[PDB]
Design a protein around this ligand. Structure first.
Ligand SMILES: *[C@@H]1O[C@H](CO)[C@@H](O[C@@H]2O[C@H](CO)[C@@H](O[C@@H]3O[C@H](CO[C@H]4O[C@H](CO)[C@@H](O)[C@H](O)[C@@H]4O)[C@@H](O)[C@H](O)[C@@H]3O)[C@H](O)[C@H]2NC(C)=O)[C@H](O)[C@H]1NC(C)=O
Lengths: 106, 209, 217
């Protein structure tokens, strides 16, 4: 029962800066829950995020690892993935892109 | 986390009124916050929002009539010169494009005239009726203004099957409603009615006639 | 931007599908949310950004569309889905949009059709404490019924045309049924001058009638 992390190719969201938001990734596992992290792309490198709240949720027999934005801000714009190391193999999801739209500020 | 509101009350036309939105479990000052109102029996109407940095924007019909402002702990909606048409429940909510947490609403009544406390009466089936193993009893809450009243049974401990009907409004402006509950004929029940606008409360013990 | 929400009301059977439409007067590029509102409760977010499901909302609720055209579809309809639904344009919050409004559509009342059930009818004569106030209100309650009913009041056989107020609970979340309260208000002098008080609850070809005689209560 291999660990799998699913994000559909070309996954994307547009959200207004100042609003609450979360990104989710479904984690498939059968033994102990793997240690999953979120990372954010900087060029070709997916940089581990450690300063942003993460949580786990169970929904319809599926586990989700969640990244929280409280609220989303313009700097949160970019591409994100979930990642885990399972038996000496780096397993990362496809990128999801968060496009942050600036709020009315006239 | 949750959003709370306060400030809804009866005012005469032209009397300035401030409503307040506060939060439990999040910092209300650092999100976009929107205000939406609803006239009794009508649809939702967007008023305006204040952005996460503290700048406010309004629907054209609201501009000049309403001001949204914030502090480090509150978001306020001020109605400069209320008209009878501003009678409505006012809601505040966290987020605009993802507006996820909503307050319970606070009820504003804009009217001439003074408040009126309700008269509360027990409801029991005709005494000449054959007793059953079960009985439906109630309380009539008659002739109050403004809304709302609260009705509970046995201090909130009795909740099963309780039907508290929506208020009805007479042309005079006075409201009435009823609440009924079904219990076994062996066990008395008490309706607890309160009308904050007149600082009144009534406890009525209802027994099968 | 104006939002045109249709239909204004719809009835569908349990297990069925509800389709609600919202048209924007110009493209709003998927800046649109859908809400559910039950009587007495705040709006509940279902969908934001046209198609994104809010947390805790079942996947039976689906939002779709783009540009000017938006659709909310509710599949496998439950009695618990009885509510009024609204779209909201959220484009006014986007930097540079010309209008600062974030307007709601007019709403869609959804009636969920369960099994038909005739009402059980109760009548409540006024207590002596009421009579002493000079005004009496007689209460009739039609319990656990579907579809909608009409109420007629009679006093010694004469149909009443004034002094009547009706109020209805929301559909029950388990069985889709309504409850109704109907009141008839008279002066104590009028009340004391008549004998038989009758509430007749009509549901198509079915009627349920409840009466009392003033002297017996
Ligand atoms: C918010 O973050 C977004 C994600 O980083 C930003 O979107 C990126 O914007 C840049 C600059 O406009 C685009 O760069 C172009 O990339 C294409 C190739 O794109 C395709 O291939 C890459 C992988 O190499 C893939 O990630 C893309 O999805 C495409 O399949 C080049 O041919 C161009 O010359 C140019 O360099 C990125 O493509 C774009 N990425 C995405 C996912 O949209 C966005 O600009 C940020 N917004 C703000 C306001 O900062």
């Amino acid at each position: 029962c291999d660990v799998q992390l699913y994000i559909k190719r070309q996954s994307e969201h547009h959200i207004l800066a100042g609003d609450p938001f979360e990104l989710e990734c479904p984690v498939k596992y059968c033994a102990n829950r793997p240690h999953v992290t979120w990372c954010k792309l900087n060029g070709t490198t997916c940089v581990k995020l450690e300063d942003r709240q993460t949580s786990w949720k169970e929904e319809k027999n599926i586990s989700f690892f969640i990244l929280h934005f409280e609220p989303v801000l313009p700097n949160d714009n970019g591409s994100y993935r979930c990642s885990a190391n399972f038996q000496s193999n780096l397993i990362e999801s496809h990128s999801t892109t968060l496009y942050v739209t600036d709020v009315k500020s006239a | 986390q949750s959003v709370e509101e306060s400030g809804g009350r009866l005012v005469t036309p032209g009397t300035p009124l401030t409503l307040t939105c506060t939060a439990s479990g999040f910092d209300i000052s650092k999100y976009n916050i929107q205000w939406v109102r609803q006239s009794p029996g009508k649809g939702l109407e967007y008023i305006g929002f204040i952005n996460y940095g503290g700048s406010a924007y309004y629907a054209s019909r609201a501009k000049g009539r309403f001001t949204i402002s914030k502090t480090s702990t509150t978001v306020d909606l001020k109605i400069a010169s209320p008209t009878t048409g501003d009678t409505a429940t006012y809601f505040c909510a966290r987020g605009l494009s993802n507006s996820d947490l909503w307050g319970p609403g606070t009820l504003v009544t804009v009217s001439l005239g003074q408040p009126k406390a309700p008269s509360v009466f027990p409801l029991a089936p005709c005494c000449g009726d054959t007793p059953s193993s079960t009985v439906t009893l109630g309380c009539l809450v008659k002739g109050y203004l403004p809304e709302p009243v609260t009705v509970t049974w046995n201090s909130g401990t009795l909740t099963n099957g309780v039907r508290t009907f929506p208020s009805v409004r007479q042309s005079s402006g006075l409201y009435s409603l009823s609440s009924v509950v079904s219990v076994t004929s062996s066990s008395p029940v008490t309706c607890n009615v309160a009308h904050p606008a007149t600082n009144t409360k009534v406890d009525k013990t209802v027994a099968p006639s | 931007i104006d939002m045109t929400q249709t239909p204004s009301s719809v009835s569908e059977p349990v297990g069925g599908t509800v389709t609600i439409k919202c048209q924007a007067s110009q493209s709003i590029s998927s800046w649109l949310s859908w809400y559910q509102q039950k009587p007495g409760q705040p709006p509940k977010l279902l969908i934001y950004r046209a198609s994104t499901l809010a947390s805790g909302i079942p996947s039976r609720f689906k939002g779709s569309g783009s540009g000017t055209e938006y659709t909310l579809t509710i599949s496998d309809l439950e009695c618990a889905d009885a509510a009024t639904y609204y779209c909201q344009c959220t484009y006014g919050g986007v930097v540079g949009s010309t209008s600062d409004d974030n307007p709601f559509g007019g709403g869609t009342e959804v009636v969920v059709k369960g099994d038909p059930v005739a009402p059980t009818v109760l009548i409540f004569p006024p207590a002596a404490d009421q009579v002493a106030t000079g005004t009496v209100t007689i209460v009739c309650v039609a319990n656990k019924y579907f579809p909608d009913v009409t109420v007629t009041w009679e006093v010694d056989g004469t149909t009443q045309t004034t002094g009547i107020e009706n109020s209805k609970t929301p559909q029950n979340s388990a069985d889709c049924t309504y409850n109704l309260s109907s009141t008839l208000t008279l002066t104590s002098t009028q009340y004391n001058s008549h004998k038989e008080y009758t509430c007749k609850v009509t549901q198509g070809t079915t009627s349920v009638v409840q009466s009392f005689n003033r002297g017996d209560c």
